[PDB]
Amino acid sequence: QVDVVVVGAGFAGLTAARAVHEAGRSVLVLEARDRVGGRTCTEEHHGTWIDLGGQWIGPGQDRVAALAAELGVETYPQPTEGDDVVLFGDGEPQRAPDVALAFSDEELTAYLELAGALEAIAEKVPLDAPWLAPEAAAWDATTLREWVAGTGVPDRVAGLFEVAVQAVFAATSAQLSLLHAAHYVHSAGGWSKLTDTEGGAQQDRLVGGVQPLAERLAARLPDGALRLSTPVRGLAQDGDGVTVRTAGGEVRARRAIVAVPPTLAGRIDHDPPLPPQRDQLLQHMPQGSVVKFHVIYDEPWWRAEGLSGTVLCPDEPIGVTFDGTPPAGTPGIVTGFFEGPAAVAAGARTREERRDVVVDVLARTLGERARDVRDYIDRDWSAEPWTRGCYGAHLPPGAWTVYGPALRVPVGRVHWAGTETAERWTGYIDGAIESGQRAAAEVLAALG
Amino acid sequence: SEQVDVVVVGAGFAGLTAARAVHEAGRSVLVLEARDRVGGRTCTEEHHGTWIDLGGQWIGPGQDRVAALAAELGVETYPQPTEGDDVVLFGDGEPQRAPDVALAFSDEELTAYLELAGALEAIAEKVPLDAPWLAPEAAAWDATTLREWVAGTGVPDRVAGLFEVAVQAVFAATSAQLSLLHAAHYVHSAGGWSKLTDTEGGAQQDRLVGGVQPLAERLAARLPDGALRLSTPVRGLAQDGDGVTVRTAGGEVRARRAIVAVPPTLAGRIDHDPPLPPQRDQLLQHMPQGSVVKFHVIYDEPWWRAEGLSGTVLCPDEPIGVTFDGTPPAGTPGIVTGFFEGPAAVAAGARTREERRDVVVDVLARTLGERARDVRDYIDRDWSAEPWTRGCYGAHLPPGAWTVYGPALRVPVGRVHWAGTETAERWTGYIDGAIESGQRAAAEVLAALG
Ligand SMILES: *Cc1cc2c(cc1C)nc1c(=O)[nH]c(=O)nc-1n2C[C@H](O)[C@H](O)[C@H](O)COP(=O)(O)OP(=O)(O)OC[C@H]1O[C@@H](n2cnc3c(N)ncnc32)[C@H](O)[C@@H]1O
Ligand SMILES: *Cc1cc2c(cc1C)nc1c(=O)[nH]c(=O)nc-1n2C[C@H](O)[C@H](O)[C@H](O)COP(=O)(O)OP(=O)(O)OC[C@H]1O[C@@H](n2cnc3c(N)ncnc32)[C@H](O)[C@@H]1O
Numbered sequence: 081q082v083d084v085v086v087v088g089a090g091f092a093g094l095t096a097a098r099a100v101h102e103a104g105r106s107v108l109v110l111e112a113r114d115r116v117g118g119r120t121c122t123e124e125h126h127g128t129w130i131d132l133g134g135q136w137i138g139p140g141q142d143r144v145a146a147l148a149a150e151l152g153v154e155t156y157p158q159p160t161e162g163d164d165v166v167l168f169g170d171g172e173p174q175r176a177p178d179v180a181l182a183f184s185d186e187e188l189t190a191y192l193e194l195a196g197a198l199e200a201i202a203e204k205v206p207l208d209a210p211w212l213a214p215e216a217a218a219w220d221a222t223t224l225r226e227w228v229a230g231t232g233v234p235d236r237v238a239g240l241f242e243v244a245v246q247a248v249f250a251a252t253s254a255q256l257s258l259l260h261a262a263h264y265v266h267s268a269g270g271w272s273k274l275t276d277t278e279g280g281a282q283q284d285r286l287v288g289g290v291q292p293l294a295e296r297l298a299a300r301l302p303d304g305a306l307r308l309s310t311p312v313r314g315l316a317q318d319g320d321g322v323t324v325r326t327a328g329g330e331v332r333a334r335r336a337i338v339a340v341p342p343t344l345a346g347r348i349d350h351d352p353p354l355p356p357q358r359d360q361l362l363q364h365m366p367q368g369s370v371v372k373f374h375v376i377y378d379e380p381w382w383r384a385e386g387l388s389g390t391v392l393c394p395d396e397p398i399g400v401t402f403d404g405t406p407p408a409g410t411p412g413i414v415t416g417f418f419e420g421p422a423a424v425a426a427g428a429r430t431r432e433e434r435r436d437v438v439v440d441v442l443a444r445t446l447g448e449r450a451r452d453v454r455d456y457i458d459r460d461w462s463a464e465p466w467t468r469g470c471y472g473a474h475l476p477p478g479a480w481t482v483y484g485p486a487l488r489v490p491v492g493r494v495h496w497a498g499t500e501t502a503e504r505w506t507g508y509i510d511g512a513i514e515s516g517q518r519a520a521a522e523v524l525a526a527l528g
Numbered sequence: 529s530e531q532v533d534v535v536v537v538g539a540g541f542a543g544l545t546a547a548r549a550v551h552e553a554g555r556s557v558l559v560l561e562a563r564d565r566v567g568g569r570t571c572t573e574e575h576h577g578t579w580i581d582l583g584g585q586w587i588g589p590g591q592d593r594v595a596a597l598a599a600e601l602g603v604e605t606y607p608q609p610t611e612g613d614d615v616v617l618f619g620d621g622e623p624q625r626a627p628d629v630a631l632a633f634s635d636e637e638l639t640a641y642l643e644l645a646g647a648l649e650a651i652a653e654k655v656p657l658d659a660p661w662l663a664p665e666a667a668a669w670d671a672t673t674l675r676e677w678v679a680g681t682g683v684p685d686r687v688a689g690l691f692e693v694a695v696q697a698v699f700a701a702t703s704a705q706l707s708l709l710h711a712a713h714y715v716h717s718a719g720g721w722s723k724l725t726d727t728e729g730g731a732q733q734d735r736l737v738g739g740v741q742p743l744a745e746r747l748a749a750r751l752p753d754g755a756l757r758l759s760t761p762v763r764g765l766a767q768d769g770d771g772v773t774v775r776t777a778g779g780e781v782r783a784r785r786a787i788v789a790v791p792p793t794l795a796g797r798i799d800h801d802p803p804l805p806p807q808r809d810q811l812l813q814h815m816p817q818g819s820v821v822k823f824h825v826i827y828d829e830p831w832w833r834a835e836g837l838s839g840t841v842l843c844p845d846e847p848i849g850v851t852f853d854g855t856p857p858a859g860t861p862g863i864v865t866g867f868f869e870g871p872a873a874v875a876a877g878a879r880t881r882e883e884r885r886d887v888v889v890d891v892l893a894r895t896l897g898e899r900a901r902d903v904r905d906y907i908d909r910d911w912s913a914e915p916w917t918r919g920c921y922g923a924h925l926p927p928g929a930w931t932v933y934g935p936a937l938r939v940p941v942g943r944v945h946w947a948g949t950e951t952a953e954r955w956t957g958y959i960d961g962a963i964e965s966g967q968r969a970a971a972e973v974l975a976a977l978g
């Protein structure tokens with residue numbers, strides 16, 4: 081009987097396991113995949129790292145910053161310089177030193193007042209208990225889209241905001257409760273923290289990619305602690321401990337930490353069954369929809385034309401793009417996303433069809449050289465059986481107030497981690513690390 | 529390990545309807561059922577010398593499949609009691625008695641209610657029953673909650689309040705949780721707002737003598753010996769070019785095709801190899817089941833009848849929104865049937881049976897009167913706590929789900945086909961729709977074998 085079994089070797093499960101180990105307790109980590117990292121995933125292509133999952137860290141994300149400094153992983157900055165390209169409907173593409181400058185003064189004022197009003201709501205939502213916001217009932221009964229419509233902003237401001245909503249949540253403003261969106265904004269420290277490159281969540285990348293950071297963290301566990309390719313099928317508990325059922329047999333432990341996405345946590349055969357509020361909470365925490373891609377060129381040819389590699393095209397299937405080129409300055413990479421409904425349409429299509437859509441948008445925005453592609457690499461996170469959607473879960477109207485209170489509460493000897501249980505930077509790597517520290521501290525107090 | 533033409537997962541009305549159709553067409557069939565019984569979301573226990581329907585209980589006009597099955601298998605109906613005054617208790621003031629609930633409203637309020645139901649029916653008729661995502665305004669209707677749509681109409685507070693009671697009693701969810709497209713499809717599927725909410729002439733018109741689980745048991749008895757396997761949950765469903773391998777705790781069954789006939793949330797928990805396509809997996813994440821605790825309060829006699837009361841109370845501002853006289857034809861024991869719905873169901877499910885009893889008796893004491901404290905017994909079921917349902921009455925879809933994920937609802941995944949009330953075109957969410965879905969999935973499987 082080990083002291084603690086951890087289900088999942090993402091940043092949450094690995095953080096919890098390392099904290100249990102460092103306190104002197106025995107720990108086993110059971111991971112479904114043949115690798116650690118979960119929603120972070122890095123492959124070597126064209127002599128560099130391709131981050132197919134989470135890739136960016138930014139100011140305010142102190143837990144991931146500290147971990148990367150501890151384990152010796154250096155950062156490099158997201159490129160910021162050169163003209164962004166903005167494309168509206170059937171128009172001609174517009175080059176601007178920033179996205180902002182493609183909108184009128186009145187439009188920019190309406191956008192900043194809309195963001196400001198969402199921040200003023202956010203600041204009233206308690207990070208540990210969104211259901212205890214003074215206006216929780218009203219805010220939980222309203223979609224973000226209904227709230228945006230009630231502000232009277234112009235069409236183009238609503239469309240620009242919607243690009244930002246889809247880029248952050250991997251879901252439309254109609255899918256999200258206003259209470260969910262407000263908690264998320266509060267959790268990150270503001271709308272600028274979510275949407276900015278410099279000063280925001282997209283500021284910095286990790287040299288070598290993110291999955292090798294998770295690997296360095298797993299290398300702090302003793303040999304024998306990690307079991308890969310070992311999906312957890314069942315989790316039983318009684319007065320004396322827990323029993324974990326796998327295809328290849330059973331593990332006995334005193335306590336468990338389940339650190340997987342909510343929809344996957346619900347699919348485990350729990351004995352006794354989870355209490356009904358927690359089962360229905362997981363039914364009400366759907367994962368987002370995102371296809372992430374990297375278009376590979378021999379060189380970042382856009383930079384010589386004075387372009388950043390960032391395109392903003394509210395009427396196209398892809399959202400914002402980014403220059404994904406490593407510090408070596410080759411190969412050239414354009415990074416971007418299909419989000420929400422576009423991700424679901426694109427996921428039903430082949431890699432080749434997705435390639436063709438992306439290359440066509442870039443050809444009409446960055447220029448005709450976009451057609452001279454070396455390679456196109458993508459990942460539909462909704463098709464990953466051990467994730468079933470990126471970036472993370474969202475909550476539709478009525479879920480946070482009625483089912484939300486069951487989010488973190490241990491069920492007997494079973495404790496919960498994962499980015500979706502974080503108070504700060506929920507949905508991000510930094511939040512996953514928070515959640516593992518919290519679950520470890522709970523289990524260590526319970527064993528003692 | 530055993531080999532058969534068709535394996536059916538689940539012995540609700542959908543799985544049993546399918547299994548019987550496959551059997552009668554001359555194919556070999558196994559039915560694997562997780563529980564030690566058939567019936568699923570229909571469940572009947574014997575208490576106080578009568579039947580207690582803990583699950584589905586009513587059938588009404590326009591439900592032709594369940595009416596035909598009951599007649600075929602010799603199950604008689606009895607009418608839901610209609611007579612006596614209903615009691616309406618609004619957020620303010622004393623309880624009002626009226627020969628019908630509508631008489632509790634002002635003329636302005638009744639007009640507003642009927643115009644709101646009529647405007648919803650007009651939208652509902654434009655929603656194709658086979659493909660709600662092909663409605664001409666699907667994108668707009670799928671982006672709006674039913675609550676937002678109601679707010680836009682400008683009806684008075686008491687009208688929104690009563691409409692909310694009906695919404696929660698029909699969907700086991702609040703108007704905020706539901707897309708307008710979902711609600712509208714459901715209304716079209718039933719044949720209108722009256723069909724959903726009426727007793728006489730609607731879905732609550734009739735009961736089955738003996739209760740509903742005996743009907744499911746008579747349907748299971750139409751299968752050959754050895755076809756039904758109770759207490760056999762399905763854990764895994766592996767498929768290849770030639771068949772499907774069904775994994776249970778103790779073994780495996782090999783079939784040519786499978787019909788999975790379980791609630792959407794439980795279908796998604798089965799270990800599929802290859803994994804389900806992403807649109808389908810994400811649709812199941814967007815099909816949460818409702819939240820209801822159903823109760824029967826037992827009295828020696830239906831005492832409210834001697835006071836000229838129907839035993840129906842309507843309370844927009846109480847944890848119990850609606851009740852019915854549940855008394856069997858013999859006239860004893862007296863029964864008051866009712867529901868905790870939505871947020872009230874989740875709050876009540878966290879408390880004990882005795883605590884839920886004391887909430888119900890408090891509402892009934894203030895509406896039916898003092899004799900409501902003279903309880904012989906109290907029987908209830910939290911359908912959210914049932915591991916093989918995880919919420920009644922059925923799934924609903926939040927905003928954005930029908931147009932983006934919805935097209936994957938019925939489409940087979942190789943040799944795995946889908947049944948259940950949630951896949952029905954007509955009377956979706958009812959026993960009638962469970963039966964439709966079983967006939968459809970059997971016809972599909974029989975056409976694809978040859
Ligand atoms: C997918 C993605 C995520 C992402 C993003 C872009 C995409 C396409 N961009 C990000 C970014 O640039 N910066 C950032 O900070 N975050 C970004 N995100 C989100 C981020 O990747 C996630 O928040 C974070 O990685 C989540 O970590 P957590 O540890 O909470 O969850 P996980 O990585 O999903 O790990 C769960 C592990 O459990 C395994 N699994 C699942 N089920 C089982 C069972 N039954 N048995 C055993 N193991 C199981 C998974 O395989 C996984 O390893
Ligand atoms: C619960 C409920 C339902 C209900 C209602 C009141 C309540 C509290 N009132 C209704 C009414 O008065 N009239 C009516 O027509 N319907 C009413 N409803 C809804 C109705 O009960 C359902 O629509 C209908 O019964 C649904 O039937 P279906 O056949 O589609 O589904 P099921 O009954 O849930 O059966 C599924 C079976 O599958 C088994 N199961 C689940 N998972 C597994 C696995 N993994 N392996 C094997 N078997 C599985 C279940 O145990 C169940 O038997």
Ligand SMILES: [Mg+2]
Binds near residue numbers: 160
């Ligand atoms: Mg810039």
Ligand SMILES: [Mg+2]
Binds near residue numbers: 610627628838
């Ligand atoms: Mg009447």
Ligand SMILES: [Mg+2]
Binds near residue numbers: 653716
């Ligand atoms: Mg019609």
